[PDB]
Amino acid sequence: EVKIILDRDPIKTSFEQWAKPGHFSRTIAKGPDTTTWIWNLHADAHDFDSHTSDLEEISRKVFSAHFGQLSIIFLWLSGMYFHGARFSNYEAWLNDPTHIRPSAQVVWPIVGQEILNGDVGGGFRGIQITSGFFQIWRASGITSELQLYCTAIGALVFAGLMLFAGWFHYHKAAPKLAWFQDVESMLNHHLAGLLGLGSLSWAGHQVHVSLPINQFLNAGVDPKEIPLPHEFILNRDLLAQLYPSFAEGATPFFTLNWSKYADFLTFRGGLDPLTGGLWLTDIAHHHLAIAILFLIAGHMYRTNWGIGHGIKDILEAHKGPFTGQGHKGLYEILTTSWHAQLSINLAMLGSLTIVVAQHMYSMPPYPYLATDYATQLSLFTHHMWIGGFLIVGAAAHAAIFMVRDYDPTTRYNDLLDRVLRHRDAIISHLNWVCIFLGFHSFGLYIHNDTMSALGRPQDMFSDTAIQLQPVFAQWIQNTHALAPGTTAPGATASTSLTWGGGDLVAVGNKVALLPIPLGTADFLVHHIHAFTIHVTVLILLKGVLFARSSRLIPDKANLGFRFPCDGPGRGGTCQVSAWDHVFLGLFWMYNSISVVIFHFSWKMQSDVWGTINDQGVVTHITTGNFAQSSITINGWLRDFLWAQASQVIQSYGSSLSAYGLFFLGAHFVWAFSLMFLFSGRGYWQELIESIVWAHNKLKVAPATQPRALSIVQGRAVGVTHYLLGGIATTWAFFLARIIAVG
Amino acid sequence: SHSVKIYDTCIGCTQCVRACPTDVLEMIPWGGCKAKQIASAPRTEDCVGCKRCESACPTDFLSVRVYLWHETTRSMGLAY
Amino acid sequence: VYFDLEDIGNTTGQWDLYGSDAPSPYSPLQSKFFETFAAPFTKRGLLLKFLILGGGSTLAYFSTTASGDILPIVKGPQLPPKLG
Amino acid sequence: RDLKTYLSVAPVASTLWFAALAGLLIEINRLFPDALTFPFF
Amino acid sequence: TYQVVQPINGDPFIGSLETPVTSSPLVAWYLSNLPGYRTAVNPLLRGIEVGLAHGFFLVGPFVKAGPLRNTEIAGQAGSLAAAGLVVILSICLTIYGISSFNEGDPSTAPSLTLTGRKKQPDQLQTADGWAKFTGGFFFGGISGVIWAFFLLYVLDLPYY
Amino acid sequence: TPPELDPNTPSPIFGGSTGGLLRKAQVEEFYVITWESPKEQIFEMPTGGAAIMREGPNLLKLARKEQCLALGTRLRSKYKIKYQFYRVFPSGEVQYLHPKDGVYPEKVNPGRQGVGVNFRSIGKNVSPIEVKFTGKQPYDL
Amino acid sequence: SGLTPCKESKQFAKREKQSIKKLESSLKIYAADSAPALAINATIEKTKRRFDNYAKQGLLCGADGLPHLIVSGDQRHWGEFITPGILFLYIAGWIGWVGRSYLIAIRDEKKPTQKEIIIDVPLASRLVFRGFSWPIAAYRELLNGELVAK
Ligand code: CLA
Ligand code: CLA
Ligand code: CLA
């Protein structure tokens, strides 16, 4: 076969269908008879494979939808750059980053809100931002508000192009099903074209704009005096005085004999003692390897020249004694089901966001990011939630595939088979591990609480009594310390300062990073992590494996992916559906992530962040109480929650009172969720009966018959507010705390 | 086991019999409606109580009702 | 593998899987020593009573003690708020 | 386009309505702030 | 073409599956020789062995992790607790048996051998046998604790 | 009319599943469903994952019955097939369950006699107090 | 009325005083001719105006130093509750009356729900000003106010 560009001519464009609500569904396009109609309209709006059964049409819908998504992201980026141009103190912050608070939002003087425009420094009144954009912009060598303004226009223009493309590829030239399926092609391009050229491109701006300008900023020269980026490209003299390797052209690269380029590219590693961020000389070099690597990787798959790989070939040839003919037929499944692809992608993109958070705190990439605790606590916590959510979404679509696309008669797999043929063995074991982890992580805490309360500190699990020293993580930690020179001779300093041992970095009076200690307190929390994660996995995997059938419900697959139950029979069968497993898994992801970000916040303030003076004396924020008081639930209640929540409950009258409002505001919607979660629509519908009576009495009863929320929606509404309330509370709590104290 | 009854309000649509997962109901000759048939619960010992029958009745008020009663192995839907 | 009404047991996998059926590997006399000395506890009922009454009073007996915590001991008691 | 008019007057009618209301309320306040009572009688 | 994983005893419509951890010759040999599976032996006899092994083993955790030692001279007394747990357990067993099996009743184990050799009537699992098993479990349990404790007095072991 | 009987007929090709019979089958009951297949075909097992129908008569033993009807119902549609299922017990007696009266239950048959039908339909039942202390229940009437 | 009028309350004066000093403190960092300064001076002028009006409109104050409202019906404080309230009931009645005028216009029609999710704005604009004289709902009440079926 030969891969090519395939499209079709115009397929309609009119406001006619805008005027017709629920047009996409044949059931709902007839209009409402009850208020249920309205909710269904929004819940089935994006269910494309529920609209039609043609794979070509569904594929064309999701393709333009991605253009729509990108359009928004570009419009969203356009605003952040614009606000950094009109309503910000970036130019002020650019001179004194260590003392001036970054702010990019001014509030109108109505009703008394102007109080939120607090003293952020630089003779500026506004709201302190924790997005981190200031450190990105300084890293890109962005000097003036003009350049941020130009990027704002550039992003807005791109937003228009993205939006235009979506219309063009759904209404004008719609890609054919064969085009979407060319996966050997797409992977080649996304590997080489998007990632390879993308990383290559940024490696260029760095070694021409970022690296030159950043050196000036660090020398201490006034930002307004620093030559524009284009003065470095034109006159190579400027980029020759600093980084003299530029004296030659393509040589030595072209003549190989690498390199005299060690001058602006190196494997130094560690952290810049003056900026607190990763060496820009390393990052530029880093993107150089990433480019080439992905450019190499972009030539694995065979297309139109017989050289490369057929993915279908690779899979089929991977079969063992234990697994059967497994992997055979996976290519046809993954090229035929969107949900199958989305599940894998969510699981992986979500997992990636989580490693990003752990990598950006321990290896601070942007200049003056480490000592801005307000941002670092926000960035880590933000990615933890984003990654956390995306992972739960993988379970949902894995389940949807099982219900909707799974067909043994047409697209058998054998690997997917067998798994279903011992799903009780997998779930029963995962059940056991969770119970073991629960007792052996949380039970240790309850032990500690009881012994402490009985006045038996020596009978506790602690560093001063019965120690549970996490030696495996400690040994590794030590190994990365002895890594440079010994294992990796090219590396000058350690990978991270958490592995440094006897190295510390400070910017201003604040600590950027230092070796992070590990003790019994860290042992207990990690098993708590190991525990909470497994239970989340249990709920979701159980939902996927038993999505189709069960000893209780032989034909669950016929009931669909999202149904309330199958009645009170068989003892009761509420929340048997795969949807309800995602619903239940959502709470447990929340439970797990919440104790993760609390683990972060306390550990950093207690053992890492704090004030340092020029005598070496380090004074941490909470003063190193993590080791002796995080090993007790009462300790978490008192020394963590009670103690640190004082900032947000004492923020009224201050610039941080909005956090005080959102603190209580989020407690409200959280408790509000409990009305929906603890009750059933049977009561509410009967209550509405008495209320409907009153309206009929006064001739003001609506034709659209009011109905209580569906059983599933009641759960959807409940978990949504439980999440919004709980997460927003910690948000207000975190930001108020870290902005006031930090 | 559970208790399941039928009423002369039945119109012989036959939908519940089609809805039942454990073959509890069946249709029998009658002369109270144009369909000339009516549902019957001759095997309530095999019923589980999922009410799929009720969920499928179009009579104003259900003509087939399921009154959950004493629990048995059959009704508890146990494969063990 | 099979299915005969004749033999339901076998039809429904009622197999003594890991069963031995082998002769006793235990040396005799040893068995006989244990068979005559552990015999009183094999009657049931009586064992139940022996463990309750015996276990109960044996437990009571450790009522008696020293380095448990029977000593508020010479320590001046606080007041310690409005007093009392 | 008749039809475009039709997209409108949907729940976009709510937002156009409430945005107008919000504006009016805001201007009133900007004009008469901190009012705890009706003092004209 | 050779798969390792097979239906149980060749019957794919029955619960379990055959895997290396279930039907290996090593696993089969080991499990068939535990005191529990010696179907043809005195239940009382089988029990004592279980008690002895279990008893002996229980002393360790109680003594080492006990409130009484942990640098506190109480020491080997813990073993005494272990002697208390084998009493609790014995009670449970006695209860399980009494409730399960009736006096007149016969065995409830399975007579067919895995291979269908109907030839085999079996076990305790009767009111009479179980009582014997527990009764022996106790005797062995107490004796197990005592001998471990006995070793504790003599000493020499690296942990304690 | 007399029901069909069996049984020595072969069973379908499967590899083994964990959803299979348990002790309940051994000591309480178990079920068998049987059918005739025109071709050797592949079908989704209620308990497990995937199995191959064997051309000609086929025999399957399942626990719980509902599993029997779920599979059987699938057999009727999807592919056109005629099926029947019986209740085994442990002694060896067997019991014909479905269809049980010649024809399927959806279709009205003259042989059938009504059970549990109240001719005073409606919710014309009496208040609980009326039967208080009378073992009866209002619907039973 | 165990309170003292705000005009003659020391606590009420201490609050105006303390508030102005807080805003003036912030005034120091920004220097004179400045945007924040003008913004803060505008809040200060808005602050003085506020307290001035409360005293001017005879509102009592509590030991706390904050005004308190009398809703008993006392004539000196209708401004506090009764006057604004009647204003409310007028508007609330207006909205409800217009809303009920729409449903009755809609009820005998085609698909009535169609105009409940897609508003008939020509019809609505025709009925909105009927709420101006909504308290002549009273005269509907003398006849066709509410349904007799229930
Ligand atoms: C500008 C002219 C235009 C017109 C007249 C149409 C008309 C139509 N489109 Mg096309 N479309 C357009 C532009 C247009 N589209 C563009 C620029 C894109 C790229 C994204 C698309 C991509 C697209 C897809 C994938 C599909 C259509 C479909 C349709 C038909 C369904 C009608 C409908 O209800 O749409 C919807 C009306 C709306 C008002 C939806 C608005 C959605 C926007 C993007 C939300 C923006 C996000 C928002 C900011 C989130 C914040 C919320 C928060 C503030 C609370 C209809 C003929 C569908 C079809 O063929 O029917 C089966 C279909 O599948 N369109
Ligand atoms: C790549 C990302 C991605 C994509 C493309 C999809 C796509 C889809 N999902 Mg999946 N999902 C995802 C991630 C994703 N999901 C994640 C991360 C989770 C875990 C929570 C889920 C869990 C999930 C479930 C349980 C279900 C889906 C379903 C669907 C399908 C229809 C959904 C719909 O109509 O939209 C409708 C959109 C709405 C009704 C918007 C509701 C607003 C939300 C609930 C609250 C937003 C609040 C906001 C964040 C902040 C508050 C602001 C407020 C005050 C204004 C569609 C194929 C449904 C399905 O049946 O699949 C076929 C289905 O039931 N998804
Ligand atoms: C704080 C309240 C709370 C607690 C304690 C639990 C506990 C548990 N959940 Mg639940 N869960 C909760 C809230 C809670 N959940 C809420 C609000 C939801 C709604 C979304 C869920 C949804 C949910 C699902 C879907 C699942 C669980 C599961 C589990 C079990 C996980 C396995 C385990 O750890 O074993 C260990 C048990 C503990 C750690 C409990 C504490 C034990 C104490 C400390 C020791 C014993 C005390 C003492 C010695 C006992 C003797 C006292 C005597 C006087 C009687 C565990 C029992 C999973 C499961 O079933 O397990 C496999 C499961 O799938 N939960």
Author numbering:
A (entry chain A): 17 to 758
B (entry chain C): 2 to 81
C (entry chain H): 53 to 136
D (entry chain J): 2 to 42
E (entry chain L): 53 to 212
F (entry chain D): 71 to 211
G (entry chain F): 80 to 229
What does the paper say about this structure?
After an additional photon is absorbed by any of the 200 antenna pigments of PSI, its energy migrates through this large network of connected pigments and eventually oxidizes P700, a special chlorophyll pair located at the center of PSI. The structure of plant PSI includes 12 core subunits bound with four light-harvesting proteins comprising the LHCI antenna complex.
Here, we report the structure of plant PSI super-complex at high resolution. In contrast to the P21 symmetry of the previous crystal, the current crystal belonged to higher symmetry space group P212121. The entire complex contains 214 prosthetic groups, including 156 chlorophylls (nine assigned as chlorophyll b), 32 carotenes, and 14 lipids, many of them located at key contact points of the complex. A new configuration for PsaH shows that this subunit binds four other core subunits. A new chlorophyll bound by PsaH was identified at the current resolution. This new chlorophyll, together with pigments bound by PsaL, probably participates in energy transfer into the core, suggesting that PsaH is not simply a ‘landing pad’ for LHCII, but is also important for energy transfer into the core during state II. At the current resolution, we observed new core chlorophyll bound between PsaG and Lhca1 and a newly discovered lipid. To summarize, the extremely fast and efficient energy transfer processes that typify PSI-LHCI occurs through only six pairs of pigment molecules located at three sites. In the Lhca1/4 interface, a new carotenoid site (numbered 4505 or L5) forms co-planar π systems (plane to plane distance 3.7 Å) with the ring of chlorophyll 4017, positioning it in a configuration that should provide efficient photo-protection from chlorophyll triplets.
